[PDB]
């Protein structure tokens, strides 16, 4: 069924809450035993958001290999993503260790450091060229190279140096700065423009490791980003684009991380973004 008609049908009948609860009921349940070990309590932001054991990213250290992060591997679309929580005061070094070890080119951030008057993640990158950051627990150095501030997003060039080997790499930071404190955006236009800027950079392409994408918990806004990207690519690749079923794609992604898409409003917004984005994919 053409999602655009499915959309109007759900909208006229006002059944978004019912559709969304169906997804919650059918979603996969896999173990997350490592996340729940006592030694990892200060590595999790939220008690009820954990990576599954089978898909969690492992840090390359013998001490403790745990980070709250998951690999979402989309086989038909030929895209992979790492979804993670916003870094905590005690996990900023782990976060950049994972970026290094997984050979990522881009980091996508969908929240502000403070929202609703509370801290939603650590200030984990440098704000001035001449004030670099050193993460002593993981032996990394991070320097701000340049910053481009636009009305709806900011893009930063960063240098990450492995101090053990003195290798350096350029990392691109894509920061969507205008998601509202409550609810979802009224139009998907600026979110789609942002997605296309990330694509254009190479950060989603198979010559690099998976993009790292986060918000506060790494499931709501972060799930909207990867869901929209994968659905648009499938519409490009298939003979019949109307065969792409956004609920089926979301359930496939939920095999790899729990809770993706947190509200019925986020589900509706994801439909809207794909419907409007397709009017470029099909050739306009």
From Swiss-Prot:
Residue list for modification N-acetylmethionine: 1
Subcellular location: Endoplasmic reticulum membrane
E.C. no: 3.1.3.48
Keyword Acetylation: yes
Gene Ontology MF: a single term: ephrin receptor binding
UniProt PTM comment: Oxidized on Cys-215; the Cys-SOH formed in response to redox signaling reacts with the alpha-amido of the following residue to form a sulfenamide cross-link, triggering a conformational change that inhibits substrate binding and activity. The active site can be restored by reduction.
Main localization (coarse): endoplasmic reticulum
Membrane topology, from the record: Peripheral membrane protein
Catalytic activity: O-phospho-L-tyrosyl-[protein] + H2O = L-tyrosyl-[protein] + phosphate
Residues engaged in binding substrate: 181, 215-221, 262
Residues recorded as bearing Cysteine sulfinic acid (-SO2H) in the entry: 215
GO BP field: actin cytoskeleton organization; cellular response to angiotensin; cellular response to fibroblast growth factor stimulus; cellular response to hypoxia; cellular response to nerve growth factor stimulus; cellular response to nitric oxide; cellular response to platelet-derived growth factor stimulus; cellular response to unfolded protein
Enzyme class: hydrolase
Tissue distribution of the protein: Expressed in keratinocytes (at protein level).
GO cellular component, one term: endoplasmic reticulum
Residues carrying Phosphoserine: 50, 242-243
Cross-link (N,N-(cysteine-1,S-diyl)serine (Cys-Ser)): 215-216
S-nitrosocysteine found at: 215
Keywords: Acetylation, Endoplasmic reticulum, Hydrolase, Membrane, Oxidation, Phosphoprotein, Protein phosphatase, S-nitrosylation
Residues bearing the modification Cysteine sulfenic acid (-SOH): 215
Domain spans labelled Tyrosine-protein phosphatase: 3-277
Subunit structure: Interacts with EPHA3 (phosphorylated); dephosphorylates EPHA3 and may regulate its trafficking and function. Interacts with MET. Interacts with NCK1.
Name by which UniProt lists this protein: Tyrosine-protein phosphatase non-receptor type 1
Gene: PTPN1
Section of the entire sequence shown: 1 to 284 of 435
């Amino acid at each position: 069924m053409e999602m655009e008609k499915e959309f109007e049908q759900i909208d006229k009948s006002g059944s978004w809450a019912a559709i969304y609860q169906d997804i919650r009921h059918e979603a996969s349940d896999f173990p997350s035993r490592v996340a729940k070990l006592p030694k990892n309590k200060n590595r999790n932001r939220y008690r009820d958001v954990s990576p599954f054991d089978h898909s969690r990213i492992k840090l390359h250290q013998e001490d403790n290999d745990y980070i709250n992060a998951s690999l979402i591997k989309m086989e038909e679309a030929q895209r992979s993503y790492i979804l993670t929580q916003g870094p905590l005061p005690n996990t900023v070094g782990h976060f950049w260790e994972m970026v290094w070890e997984q050979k990522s080119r881009g980091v996508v951030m969908l929240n502000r450091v403070m929202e609703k008057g509370s801290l939603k993640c650590a200030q984990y990158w440098p704000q001035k060229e001449e004030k670099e950051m050193i993460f002593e627990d993981t032996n990394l150095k991070l320097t701000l190279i340049s910053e481009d501030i636009k009305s709806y997003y900011t893009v930063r060039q960063l240098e990450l140096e492995n101090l053990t080997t003195q290798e350096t790499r350029e990392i691109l930071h894509f920061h969507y700065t205008t998601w509202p404190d409550f609810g979802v955006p009224e139009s998907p236009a600026s979110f789609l423009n942002f997605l296309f800027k990330v694509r254009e950079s190479g950060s989603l392409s198979p010559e690099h490791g998976p993009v790292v994408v986060h918000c506060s918990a790494g499931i709501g806004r972060s799930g909207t980003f990867c869901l929209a990207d994968t659905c648009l690519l499938l519409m490009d690749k298939r003979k019949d684009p109307s065969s792409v079923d956004i609920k089926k794609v979301l359930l496939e992604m939920r095999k790899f991380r729990m809770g993706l898409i947190q509200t019925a409003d986020q589900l509706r917004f994801s439909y809207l973004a794909v419907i409007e984005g397709a009017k470029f994919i099909m050739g306009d």
